């Protein structure tokens, strides 16, 4: 498949191990190929009865799948990861066509997807409860919840579908997944791959739709749980200037800047401000924008036209608020004529920024960098600590004392020093998709208090 030719030719819901048209409607939405602006699908948003059919069908698959063993569930999930690995370029292509991120980034998304699949497969084989000890004992066993729902986002369509379904299925649950109406295509490749690996029909069902479809899923009595889905970058004078510039571009211009907790609030010390800016703008203007399916493309189009307009409005407002545009912030017309109707824009860098500007305190969700100058550590510590734990943060400095000091002081939950799985994350994520059943076995006689 190449850019500018694909159209969806099959239904976009998935039930009983096959693609089906929604039995019920709650809206009608268009899916786009953002590189060209073409309509690749006009699909039906699922209604109440379609949601019920998917949840009932998933309840029937949960009964079979949960009664399987942890070793058998691991075997199938490893097979699914193998199929995702064998078909990575095909999946990344579909991911690019619908989402518009570069094939370079899409390949990484799928790598993370099947690595996550293998990870929770491993935990499903080695899953174990507790045994606690007058010769009597009790034991605990983790049990799946039943039918779970995963609500996807459009910036990482295939990856989020993988990261929500992998742990849920590993614990023995079924999942009804609702992709973002922007990106409905790639989620069915995963549903088809799960079925090819040997999951029962209905274990991973796909229902398309928007808010109404998502509301029906959350309200369903047979649904057990539902999984749903600014960050400052600080660069000191004692940092590795090269690593700070490279890290700055990696924090603002990956996936067209449409990433949660992006380092869009960049703090640079006055001592090394001109050197940083000059090197950032030069390397930013060298980023090749174009067809996502090209191996050298590092920035494709934005997700859709209304989002591109909302990003441009942020740049315009910043300009009228006193900010200076050094590059980008406007429509980009690529040489390729087949992309002429795509939603492209040049990555934007803004200088002369202030804390009162709206382009500093609002998530733009676009390729827009905000550079704010500061004098000393004291000033910059109190300007970027209004970030909540859910946000990320990053610091650049060649000092084991100064680094951890700022990372401790900051309230952000995911911090970075000089850049931007384990067991806990798996255990915590498995706990979200399971419940602990206790059993107390009295071997002797009962001691009555009466």
Alpha-carbon span 235 to 306, nearest angstrom: 33
Strand partners, 368: 348
Binding mask 108-147 for ligand NAD (x = CB under 6 A): ----------------------------------------
CB–CB of 12/208 below 8 Å?
A: yes
Local structure of 373: helix, strand or coil: strand
Shortest Cβ 220–ligand NAD spacing (Å): 12
* Dihedrals phi, psi of 294, to nearest 5 degrees: -85, 140
Alpha-carbon span 28 to 11, nearest angstrom: 13
Q: Residue 331 interacts with ligand NAD (CB under 6 A)?
A: no
Nearest CA among 276, 379, 265 for reference residue 318: 265
Shortest Cβ 246–its own copies spacing (Å): 4
Token couple for 190? 């995963």
When binding is defined by CB under 6 A, the residue of 71, 211, 331, 333 that contacts ligand NAD is: 211
* Dihedrals phi, psi of 62, to nearest 5 degrees: -60, -40
Point out which span in 32-40, 182-190, 279-287, 357-365 binds its own copies (CB under 8 A).
Answer: 279-287
Q: Residue 181 interacts with ligand NAD (CB under 6 A)?
A: yes
Consult the annotation and say whether 178 binds a ligand: yes
Residues near 358 by beta carbon (within 8 Å), at least 6 away in sequence: 314, 317, 318, 321
Alpha-carbon span 420 to 178, nearest angstrom: 30
**By CB under 8 A, what part of segment 75-94 binds its own copies?**
78, 82
For residue 32, count other CB atoms closer than 10 A to its CB: 24
Q: Residue 378 interacts with its own copies (CB under 8 A)?
A: no
Q: Residue 342 interacts with ligand NAD (CB under 6 A)?
A: no
When binding is defined by CB under 8 A, the residue of 43, 62, 104, 344 that contacts its own copies is: 104
Strand partners, 123: none
Q: Which is nearer to ligand NAD, 365 or 396 (CB)?
A: 365
Q: Residue 366 interacts with ligand NAD (CB under 6 A)?
A: no
When binding is defined by CB under 6 A, the residue of 16, 37, 201, 210 that contacts ligand NAD is: 210
Consult the annotation and say whether 363 binds a ligand: yes
Shortest Cβ 181–ligand NAD spacing (Å): 6
Alpha-carbon span 227 to 164, nearest angstrom: 7
Q: Residue 159 interacts with ligand NAD (CB under 6 A)?
A: no
**By CB under 8 A, what part of segment 214-253 binds its own copies?**
240, 242-243, 246-247, 249-250, 253
Residues that bind ligand NAD (CB under 6 A): 151-153, 180-181, 210-211, 214-215, 218
- Return binding residues: 178, 363
């Amino acid at each position: 498949m190449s850019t500018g030719t694909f159209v969806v030719s099959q239904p976009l819901n998935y039930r009983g191990g096959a693609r089906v048209e929604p039995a019920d409607a709650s809206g009608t939405e268009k899916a786009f190929e953002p590189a060209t602006g073409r309509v690749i699908a006009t699909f039906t948003c699922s209604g109440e009865k379609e949601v019920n059919l998917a949840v009932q069908n998933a309840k029937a698959a949960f009964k079979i799948w949960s009664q399987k063993s942890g070793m058998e569930r691991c075997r199938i999930l490893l097979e699914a990861a193998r199929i995702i690995r064998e078909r990575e370029d095909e999946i990344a292509t579909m991911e690019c066509i619908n989402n518009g991120k570069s094939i370079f980034e899409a390949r990484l998304d799928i790598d993370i997807s099947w690595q996550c699949l293998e990870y929770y497969a491993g935990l499903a084989a080695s899953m174990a409860g507790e045994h606690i000890q007058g010769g009597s004992f009790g034991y605990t066993r983790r049990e799946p919840l039943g039918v779970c729902v995963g609500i996807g986002a459009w910036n990482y369509p295939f990856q989020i579908a993988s990261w929500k379904s992998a742990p849920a299925l590993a614990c023995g649950n079924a999942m009804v997944f609702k992709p973002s109406p922007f990106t409905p295509v790639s989620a069915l490749l995963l549903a088809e791959i799960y079925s090819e690996a040997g999951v029962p029909p209905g274990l991973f069902n796909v229902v398309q739709g928007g808010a109404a479809t998502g509301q029906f899923l959350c309200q369903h009595p047979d649904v057990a749980k539902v999984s749903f889905t600014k960050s400052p970058l600080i660069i000191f004078s004692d940092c590795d200037m090269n690593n700070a510039v490279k890290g700055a571009l990696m924090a603002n211009f990956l996936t067209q800047g449409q990433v949660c907790c992006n380092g869009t609030r960049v703090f640079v010390q006055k001592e090394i401000l001109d050197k940083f800016t000059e090197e950032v703008v030069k390397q930013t203007q060298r980023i090749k924008i174009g067809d996502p399916l090209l191996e050298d493309t590092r920035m494709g189009p934005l997700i859709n036209r209304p989002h591109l307009e909302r990003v441009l409005g942020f740049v315009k407002v910043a300009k009228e608020q006193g900010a200076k545009v050094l590059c980008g912030g406007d429509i980009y017309v690529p040489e390729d004529p087949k992309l002429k109707d795509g939603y492209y824009m040049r990555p934007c860098v803004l200088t002369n920024c202030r804390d009162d500007m709206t382009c500093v305190k609002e998530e733009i969700f676009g390729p827009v960098m905000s550079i704010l100058s500061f004098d000393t550590e004291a000033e910059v510590l109190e300007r970027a600590n209004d970030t909540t734990f859910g946000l990320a943060a990053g610091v650049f400095t060649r000092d084991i004392q100064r680094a951890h000091r700022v990372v401790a002081e900051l309230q952000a939950g995911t911090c970075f020093i000089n850049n931007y799985f384990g067991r806990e994350n798996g255990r915590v994520t498995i706990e979200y998709y399971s419940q602990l059943k206790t059993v107390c076995v009295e071997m002797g006689d009962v001691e009555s208090a009466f």
